[PDB]
Every structure is written in structure tokens, then in C-alpha cells.
């Protein structure tokens, strides 16, 4: 359904935020 | 539908937050 | 509809958060 | 309606978060 | 209604996050 | 109701995030 | 119900974010 | 159901954000 699919797009975008935060951790460790 | 479309706009805005965080990682690495 | 319009206001506010984070990246690069 | 009004209050609170992040950018630039 | 009231509690909590971020800006300016 | 109660748990968790950010402000001031 | 249970999982995940932020405060204080 | 499953995916993505923040704490402690 379209609402479930849109909520899954929100989850994917939150995962993109997590990936960006991991890049911040690696930048600080460097 | 309009609710699904609005939830997709929320997902797009969260992706914009992820892109900004990636720019923060690049700024710290520099 | 009013709920879709309110969800679009949430998306616009999240975009404002992304814009503020981009300003943080530019401040760090400077 | 009451649900739309409450979602608009969430959007206003997210805008307050964006404004605070802009203040963080100005603090880092200083 | 109870759902609208709970969404208003979420908005109040997000405002508390904005207030905490403002304290971070003041700490950096100091 | 159970949905309102779960949304109130989300609000309480967001308040925990605000409290943690206040601790970050105190750490930076120190 | 399944939606209430899923919203409670979101609250638990937000509490995990608060715990991680508390670890950031302790790292800065050190 | 599909909406509950999508909300559980949002919770999992928020847990990924918490894990990334824990990595930021470890980077700062180092």
C-alpha cells in the first residue's frame, strides 16, 4: 500500500542519516 | 494519495538532512 | 486536506533543519 | 481539526530546532 | 482528544530539544 | 487508549534526548 | 495491538539515541 | 500488517542512528 511504502521511504532516509553520522565518527577518528 | 505524497516529502526532507550531515563529515575531515 | 497540509509543514520544517546543518558545515570549513 | 493543529505544533517545534541549529552555526563561525 | 493531546506532548518535547540546542550555542559562544 | 499511550512514550523518549543535549551543553561549558 | 507495539519500538529506539548522546556528553567531560 | 512492519523499519533505522552516535562518543574519547 502507498502509506506503508511512504513510511518505508522515511525509514530509508533515516538510514541515510545514520550512514552520514558514521562518516562524522570516521572524520573525528582521523 | 495526498497523505502518501506528504509522507514522501518528509522522506525527501530527511534525505536533505543526511546530505547536510555528509557535508559536516567532509568539513571535519578538512 | 488539512492532515496532508500539516504533514507538508513538517516536511518544510525538516528542510529548514537541513539548511541550518549546511550552515554548520560552512562554519566548520571556515 | 485537532489532529491537524497538533501536527502544525510539531512543525513549529521543528522550526525552533532549525533556529537553534542556525545559532550553533553562528557560534562556530565566531 | 487523547491522540491530539499526545501529539501536543511530542511537540512540547521537540521544543525542549530546541531549548537544549540553544544552550549548546551559548556554551560554544562562551 | 494504546496508541495515545505509545505516542506519550515517544514524547518521554524525546524529553530524554533533550536532557542528554543539556548534558552536552554543560560538558562544552566545562 | 501491532501499531501501538511498533510505536513503542520507535520510543525504545529514541531512548537508545538519548543514551548515545549521554555517552557523547561523558566523552566531552573527559 | 504492512503499516506496523513499516513503523518497525523506522525503529530499526533510529537504532542505526543511535549506533552511529555511540561511534561518535568513542571517536571523541579517542
Residue numbers in the entry:
A (entry chain F), B (entry chain G), C (entry chain H), D (entry chain A), E (entry chain B), F (entry chain C), ...: 1 to 30
What sentences appear in the manuscript?
αHBs are oligomers of 5 or more α-helical peptides that assemble into coiled-coil structures with central solvent-accessible channels.
Despite the requirements for aliphatic residues at a and d, up to 40% of these can be changed to other side chains without compromising barrel integrity. The twelve Group III peptides had positively and negatively charged side chains, Lys and Glu, incorporated either singly or paired at a and d sites; and a single peptide with Asp at d. Finally, one third of the designs were crystallized and yielded 12 X-ray crystal structures, all of which were open αHBs with fully accessible channels. Focusing on the small molecules, the αSA signal from the more-polar AAs and CHOs is dominated by the polar and charged Group II and III αHBs.
